[PDB]
Structure formats: structure tokens, C-alpha cells
Design an enzyme around this catalytic site. Sequence first.
Site, PDB file in Angstrom:
ATOM      1  N   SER A 101      -9.134  -2.225 -45.460  1.00 55.28           N
ATOM      2  CA  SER A 101      -8.703  -0.879 -45.104  1.00 55.28           C
ATOM      3  C   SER A 101      -7.204  -0.622 -44.945  1.00 55.28           C
ATOM      4  CB  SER A 101      -9.467  -0.393 -43.870  1.00 55.28           C
ATOM      5  OG  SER A 101     -10.797  -0.052 -44.244  1.00 55.28           O
ATOM      6  N   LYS A 133      -5.629   2.118 -46.996  1.00 53.03           N
ATOM      7  CA  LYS A 133      -5.542   3.498 -46.539  1.00 53.03           C
ATOM      8  C   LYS A 133      -4.125   3.923 -46.187  1.00 53.03           C
ATOM      9  CE  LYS A 133     -10.268   4.030 -44.800  1.00 53.03           C
ATOM     10  NZ  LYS A 133     -10.785   2.647 -44.995  1.00 53.03           N
ATOM     11  N   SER A 145     -10.829   4.612 -39.730  1.00 49.09           N
ATOM     12  CA  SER A 145     -10.881   4.000 -41.065  1.00 49.09           C
ATOM     13  C   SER A 145     -12.051   4.534 -41.899  1.00 49.09           C
ATOM     14  CB  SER A 145     -10.977   2.473 -40.917  1.00 49.09           C
ATOM     15  OG  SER A 145     -10.680   1.816 -42.136  1.00 49.09           O
TER      16      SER A 145
END
Length: 466
Positions: A49, A52, A298
Site C-alpha cells: 500500500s 498509494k 488504505s
Amino acid sequence: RLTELREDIDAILEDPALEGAVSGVVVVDTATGEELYSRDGGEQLLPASNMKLFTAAAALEVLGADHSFGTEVAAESAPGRRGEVQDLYLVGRGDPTLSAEDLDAMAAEVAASGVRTVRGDLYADDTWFDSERLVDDWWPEDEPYAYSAQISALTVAHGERFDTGVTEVSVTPAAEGEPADVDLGAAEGYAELDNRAVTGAAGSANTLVIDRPVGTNTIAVTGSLPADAAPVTALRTVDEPAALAGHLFEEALESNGVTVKGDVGLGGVPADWQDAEVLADHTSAELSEILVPFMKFSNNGHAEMLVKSIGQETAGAGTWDAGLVGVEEALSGLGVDTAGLVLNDGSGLSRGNLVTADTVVDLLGQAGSAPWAQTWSASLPVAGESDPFVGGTLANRMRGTAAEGVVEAKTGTMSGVSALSGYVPGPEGELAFSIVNNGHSGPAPLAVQDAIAVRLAEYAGHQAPE
Ligand SMILES: [Mg+2]
Ligand SMILES: [Mg+2]
């Protein structure tokens, strides 16, 4: 102080948890530019993640912090004498926070518009994005779970965290030997139910399993839930998010006095409709606000939707291919060297992604200097903060340390992959760091990451609260 800091981080990285793992670790003082720490900074590693960070930055650059998303309802023309219309279309244009309540408000508008009977069919139009629901290399076994929800331009987000393309399944015990009560949430009347679950004796072992068999739109429940066990809830994905929105809107219309005679399905405006009549519409909050639930928790769906929205804005194509090109160009335009970056998706779920700790720190530096720096850093989880919307995925880490309420960083963990990158502001200088671990064999080295973050907070001039 530099020598002591470096030796301490050196020592932490000797942890047996990093056995056989490669860890890119880079720390820079944003104010001066002084490289405080650097190990394997140019090594390409999976980011999970942490991907991101790139997606969010690109989104703010391309769409803008003030960007908002819309959803509309329209017919070929306004309702007639008897308040009737033929076919009706619910058109979503990438709102990652479209709630069931939002749908009811639009249903009310359809009624307040003068509509009473949809003699035709009801269509869910998500043509704003293409129909590629999942990233090519995503694992099929993960499909039933929320983080792997299908991507669509028209999708209903659940709860205040806005988890898209899912439904909340509830399982409540009955008497011993009797079938367990299973509710499908929003998906009732849409997804099929295969309830094989039974209520076990009080004090028995909970063996309940809630699944969505691959390639099906059925919620399969098996195992046993003890009669004295607390009711269970679980978010499960559904096939074709847009088709569910259509179902939910069908129910909304019905509840607001609007009858739908035809069927409900997928379809886009005929285009051969020069003067369509928009009976209802909804506008989401601005991107600066949406970033909060996106980055704090997330949210993968939000990430992939943003990539496709980036594609629509840069090339009129809500696609991963166009969106990812848009992301890379946005990053380069921001001054970030994307040479060691491989973009396969925006969430970081894909095992095809690659970053380097140097690239992450680079981004952190450029983003911290952009006009949207504050809205960007505010979306990041804050270490040790109890409020879920503040602590995010770091709410239960570093509590009671010098890092609590200081370290702003994005998380990211999968099998064999773990990362923590962000900022450590303090009177001793604004720090930017990136820790990317690949290759470990046990649990993610979260304690190692925490140790380093706390050490940085102390170096930044902070003390642990007593
Ligand atoms: Mg229903
Ligand atoms: Mg402090």
C-alpha cells in the site's frame, strides 16, 4: 548526533526478523537536504500500500484538491402527463463515496421531479470507466474480501470509511442444531445465498466461514457458530458493483413512490439521446476530504478509482493503462525521477508494482513542497492516535512513544512485503523517510519499523509522553 543515529538504525536493522530480507531504508532532512541514512535506497522492491503515496500525489496534481465526483439520474425527457417515463439510467462518474443514503436522496429527487412510473427498464451506467473489474495479476482467492472489490465508475460505498463494492454479511446464532440466521445486507435480493451454517452448542468451537466462491455471486456460509457466540459481521464483495447500485436504487425509487415496471440491469445512455433530462444528481465531497478515509485506512478501491479518474481527465479514458500513464507523467511533472518505478495499479495490491526507497523519499520531498502539501500530509495515518480517522492503520502502533502524534506515515503489508514511509516533523528538523522490507519469512517486521520511526522522532526533538 548523526553518527549515533546511524549506529542505532544500523543496530535495529540487525533484527533476526529481517532474516533473508532486503530492506531499503532512507532518511533525509527535508529542510537541509542532508542524507541522514541510506541503505539499499536504489533497490527495486514491492511497495504494498505504499503505492498509494504515488497515486494520491498524482491525483492531487491531476484532479486537484477541489475536485468533486458526480452521479446522475436521467431519462430521454422529463416525465409526461401521467408522470411516466420509459427507461431510466443511474449514471456514476467515479464517486468513491456514493452511499445508499445518497441513492435515496436521488430517488426522492426523481419523485420530486414529477416521476411516478418508470414504464421501461432501469439501467446502471458505469461506462465512465471501462469494465475491467480487477487488475490482471491480482489473486483470485482474495476476491471475496473488501480490499479486492471490483472496480466500477458506479459503486455503492459502505459505512463512514466508504468501502466500495461490498455488502455487509451478518450471521446470528439460533438454538443449538438450528440453522444460523444469515443476512446479506445491501446485497439482499441481489447476491445468492448458500447457507449451510448451523448453530453449535453453547461453549462449542466457532468454525464459521463466509465466502464468495470464485466466479459466482453467491455468499456461501459453512461451519458452526456457537449458540452463545456474539453475532458475526463481515464485509464481502459482490460481482458487478454497478448492478448492485441498480438494485439499491430500484429499492430507493420504490420507497419514494416511484414504481419500476421493467427490469434492472447494466447499460449506458443510448448516445442517440441528444436532450436527456437529468431528474436527479449528487456531488461528492472534495478530493481533499476524500483523501482522509482513502489514505488513513488504505482503501484499495479508492486508489483504483482515482487512477481511472486520472485516465479520464488526461485521456478521456477511465482505464488502468491510461490512468497509470497519467500517474507517471504527473509524478515526473512534480520533479520526481520515476526511473526505478514500475506501476501496475494504484492501490499497491498488485505484486507487479515496484518502487525504491529513494523514489519514495523523492516523492515525499516534492509533495511536501507542493501547494497541496497540507491536505496531503493530513491524510496520512498519525502514529499512536486512538481516533481511527486520525491514527488510521497506525492507531495501534507506537502509542506512548516519542512518535505518538508526530510520525505521519503510510503503511503497507502483504505476505513477504512490508513498508512504512512518511514524515517526522520536529524542532530538530523536518524528516522524510522510507522503509521497504521484502523477503522476510514471518510476520511483517512492524516492530523494526516502529523502532526506527521512534528513533527518528527522538532525533527530530521529541520525547515520549509519561
Ligand atoms: Mg434488496
Ligand atoms: Mg512530540
